[PDB]
């Protein structure tokens, strides 16, 4: 199954995401975090295939998280940014830092699941 981790400081949203993704037969939520530091700690412990990553969060933001994942971890989930902040420089930074996809809030759950499955099933070297 696709193992998903969720990082966002909106607790209600995390619960909705967890409920929906848990209802998909091919997916499982293996961890959630409410800020960037907790997200990094969660990634030390869990090895998701997919990370849903909010940007605006306390302690450490999702772009700092993205940069740390690429530089500091052996195992790397494919990351889907899921944020309200789709500012021109931020989108560009996200792709430079290794994000696999970037979805704006507000979003539809079905579209999100569609992207999860495409990103998991993705590279250029055969």
Per the annotation, binding residues for Ca(2+) are 8-9, 54
Closest CB to Ca ion among 38 and 54?
A: 54
Q: Find the shortest distance in angstroms from Cβ 29 to Ca ion.
A: 18
DSSP states along 49-113? SEEEE-SS-SSS-HHHHHHHHHHH-SS--EEEEEES---HHHHHHHHHTT-SEEEESS--HHHHH
Say whether 48 sits in a helix, a strand or coil: coil
Query: Using CB under 5 A as the criterion, what x/- string covers residues 54-83 for binding Ca ion?
Result: x-x---------------------------
Q: Find the shortest distance in angstroms from Cβ 125 to Ca ion.
A: 35
Measured distance CA(101)–CA(12) in Å, rounded: 23
Say whether 121 sits in a helix, a strand or coil: coil
Closest CA relative to residue 112, chosen from 9, 19, 38: 19
Q: Find the shortest distance in angstroms from Cβ 8 to Ca ion.
A: 6
Given the rule CB under 5 A, which of 3-11, 14-22, 99-107, 110-118 is the region that contacts Ca ion?
Answer: 3-11
Q: Which residue is nearest to Ca ion (CB)?
A: 56
Query: Using CB under 5 A as the criterion, what x/- string covers residues 94-123 for binding Ca ion?
Result: ------------------------------
H helices present in 23-87, as ranges: 36-45, 62-72
Applying CB under 5 A, which residues contact Ca ion? 9, 54, 56
């Amino acid at each position: 199954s696709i193992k998903v981790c969720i990082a966002d400081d909106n607790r209600e949203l995390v619960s909705l995401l967890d409920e929906y993704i848990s209802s998909q037969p091919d997916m499982e939520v293996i961890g959630t975090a409410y800020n960037g530091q907790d997200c990094l700690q969660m990634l030390e412990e869990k090895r998701p295939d997919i990370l849903l990553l909010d940007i605006i969060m306390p302690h450490l933001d999702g772009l700092a998280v993205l940069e740390r994942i690429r530089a500091g971890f052996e195992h790397q989930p494919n990351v889907i940014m899921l944020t309200a902040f789709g500012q021109e420089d931020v989108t560009k930074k996200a792709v430079e830092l290794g994000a696999s996809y970037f979805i704006l809030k507000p979003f539809d759950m079905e579209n999100l699941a569609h992207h999860i499955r495409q990103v998991y099933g993705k590279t250029p070297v055969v």
